Design a protein around this ligand. Structure first.
Ligand SMILES: O=[N+]([O-])c1ccccc1
Length: 175
């Protein structure tokens, strides 16, 4: 690793990680599962009614957006969503002990997974959680690769899985 390469982990954090997995879009679009989304992976609603999604958006941003937001607004919503995922882990009796056992980089992978799937979805991965707590990284990654979360939308999940396997930021290099 060059000096520059050794600096790379200090440039990566949960915000940069999710920004890569989710992308940044200033207009309402449908995600790989067909759900209306905006900003940095902000799911607006699961309903197929665009009007519902716009309504959610205006509520979330606090103004008449007509389906469009600014970069600054995307960032604020993103920071709210990250905070929500972190809070969801820490208050959960099942997720917290696993999170606490993890190193810093795998904790980011955990927050990412919760950001994507929600608390109950993640907390339902009983075997994966046990494997992570036991540092069975290869098995945990293989089991995550069986999930609908990954298989329905591999590009959004693949880097998170690799990160659980390795505890490094390598999957986020060389975009
Ligand atoms: O909160 N966690 O320990 C956690 C969350 C998501 C995936 C794996 C572990």
């Amino acid at each position: 690793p060059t000096t520059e390469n050794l600096y790379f982990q200090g440039s990566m954090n949960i915000f940069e990680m999710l920004r890569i997995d989710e992308g940044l879009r200033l207009k309402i679009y449908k995600d790989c599962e067909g759900y209306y989304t905006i900003g940095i992976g902000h799911l607006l609603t699961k309903s197929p009614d665009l009007n519902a999604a716009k309504s959610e958006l205006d509520k979330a941003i606090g103004r008449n957006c007509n389906g469009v937001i600014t970069k600054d607004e995307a960032e604020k919503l993103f920071n709210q969503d990250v905070d929500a995922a972190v809070r969801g882990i820490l208050r959960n009796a099942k997720l917290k002990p696993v999170y606490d056992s993890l190193d810093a980089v795998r904790r980011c992978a955990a927050i990412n997974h919760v950001f994507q799937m929600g608390v109950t979805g993640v907390a339902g991965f009983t075997n994966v959680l046990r494997m992570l707590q036991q540092k069975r990284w290869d098995e945990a990654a293989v089991n995550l690769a069986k999930s609908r979360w990954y298989n329905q939308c591999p590009d959004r999940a693949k880097r998170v899985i690799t990160t659980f396997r390795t505890g490094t930021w390598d999957a986020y290099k060389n975009l």
